[PDB]
Amino acid sequence: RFLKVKNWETEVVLTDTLHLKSTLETGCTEYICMGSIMHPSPEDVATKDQLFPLAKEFIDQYYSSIKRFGSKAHMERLEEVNKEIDTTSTYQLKDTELIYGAKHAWRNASRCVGRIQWSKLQVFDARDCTTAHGMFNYICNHVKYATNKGNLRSAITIFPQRTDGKHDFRVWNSQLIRYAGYKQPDGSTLGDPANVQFTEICIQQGWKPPRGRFDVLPLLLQANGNDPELFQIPPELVLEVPIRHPKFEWFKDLGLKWYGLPAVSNMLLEIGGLEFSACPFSGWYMGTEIGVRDYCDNSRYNILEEVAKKMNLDMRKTSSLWKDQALVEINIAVLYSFQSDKVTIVDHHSATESFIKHMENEYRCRGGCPADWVWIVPPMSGSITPVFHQEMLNYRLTPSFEYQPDPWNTHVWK
């Protein structure tokens, strides 16, 4: 059936036909919705039998996308892929298909509010990599290219695909650039509390921790299933921003900084039945990712109390909304600081406005846009952004970015 989505502020109604193309499951059933579950449901590798239909599906939509469906090039590619799955139990993507597949994995990422940019993605083919040193080189080049002296450029680097599940390429870092976290003797936590465990895996592997509040973690890189190896990203490649406030001259005295480059490195890229377990990708930040989640989550840097102190807010009762007041000022500071240093950043009003425009484009040219309201709506000021009022349909299209197990729970050491 055709499904309708309505915006309750503008009364615009869009008609979704694209959902008819999905064949992967959401986790919901007719009687139970799992729309707020974060992850709904080494031997698990494909077979020649499961692989050819997935390959055929992907080749078909690629040749349909360049408007040469059923062409001679299309026929030959399908046959070519057939023989290769036969004689090798897998196949290799053409460069054009790799690029198309990575852009469409972004385009299909229902949790990403930034997708208006999906077709402007620089794709770095790293499928010839064999060692952790090679991975380090490729990642440095990615970081330098994507950072671009503050004029951030979206990029993805794609390492060799899974073969037997015993020779996986993995970036063990969850993001390329993150700050360490240290469990203190007295029980509290220095640095980023989200990374205490990963920080300790780096220390346990030989990393000498400076034990500061903003220590960039080393890279921990696993190539071809071997034990991971540590590398220090050269500091001149890591662009950082001191956080200050346009009105509160005391804000700089908090000593806060953050990095300019958000770069997810723990997801799996699926294209045509092939699995790329190492595919770091990076864009630029929406301000609330830093100012709301990173700084103000109770399990993260958790700075609301200090800022509200310096603002001299009444903190005895919640109904003073002292937390909400400090939250806004922290996010003003983040946006001001990146903008003052000419580092790309987008505020949640502009970002969600762009996403509504993006949805309009996709419904017109593509017949829909899968979208996860729970993730699209920003973590502050929700209903004064236009996505709060926008009905969204969530469904799974391939190529896609998927979650995968943490490497330290699966890797057999040597």
Added chain:
Amino acid sequence: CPRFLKVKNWETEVVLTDTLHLKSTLETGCTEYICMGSIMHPRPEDVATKDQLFPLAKEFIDQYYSSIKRFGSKAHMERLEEVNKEIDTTSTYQLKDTELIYGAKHAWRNASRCVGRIQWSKLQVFDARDCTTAHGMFNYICNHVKYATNKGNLRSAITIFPQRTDGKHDFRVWNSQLIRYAGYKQPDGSTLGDPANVQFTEICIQQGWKPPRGRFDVLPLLLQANGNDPELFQIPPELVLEVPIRHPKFEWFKDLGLKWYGLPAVSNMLLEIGGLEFSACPFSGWYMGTEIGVRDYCDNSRYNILEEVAKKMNLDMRKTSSLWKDQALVEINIAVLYSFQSDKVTIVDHHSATESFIKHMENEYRCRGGCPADWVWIVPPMSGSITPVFHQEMLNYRLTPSFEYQPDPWNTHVWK
């Protein structure tokens, strides 16, 4: 479906285990391949047949007798037999007062979109199934309003009018909420009052209401009894408790002339108990501050005051990245909570309400085996991630007894 489903809180790491979803009785709108969790709403004489009614009543009666620890008793079997004979001879049945009260409280308990459910067992149930006329409905509703308002010490309550029979004799409150402000569309395209209520205000004017044409005019009740044409009544103004909005720091905030009413009372939902349909069942609680301060005042299509407050705050309004909207939104919500607390009118901030809801949810998982919750509605419309519900995974499913949406009565009424 699997027998145990787990939900995790990503801030505290608490895992809870849900078995109550096995009792879900109606459709969410989702399928295996598409999730409709952000969709807001996923014939008259089509009424329950005898064959449809028998099992729905048994399921409810079984549930009631299980709750009073009398499952399988002589009184349980006799009540089943009595109900079955009633459906046999009359095609319907009547609930006992105990069952009506249990059913209404559980429809609230089951309301997955409601963050206020820690209170569900403290609900005053007014049985109005003897009502026959719109004048009688007005009396019952006035009594409800006075009871629930309680001079500012608000008490949750529901008034239940006669159930549906053949669908041509429905009781309905045409108002979507018992207390709302009129909205007036002007020839130049602007709106005075509450823009959300323009359509209903026009209906009232057509029915004979003389509109004062102000910014905060309480709408009349438009009340339909036994399927008759609806009739207009003015709520006595001394029963409508109102709060002028001022700010603890900004002396100029009172000069905006804003006020709101104290009693949130939903009157357009259908209460379903054991297959019986109560099409007029107004229920009321107390406000969470963001319902007024974020939605009523700051939605672009409502009173839309962010600009005017931002101006009086002397904010930079040229770039969105100054977050002038967010800054003014917090101050408006501070004013709303301060004005209600100062006048001793019950209100709950979004921090306190979501923390209570988490405690309620954990208790329900422990004692009941789960708690259906709609994250999209439970998370407040401002400061989402600094409330504990943001990080709480939730399962949404539909249990009965339940509050359900129903068609707007002006779209279905057959005018006499």
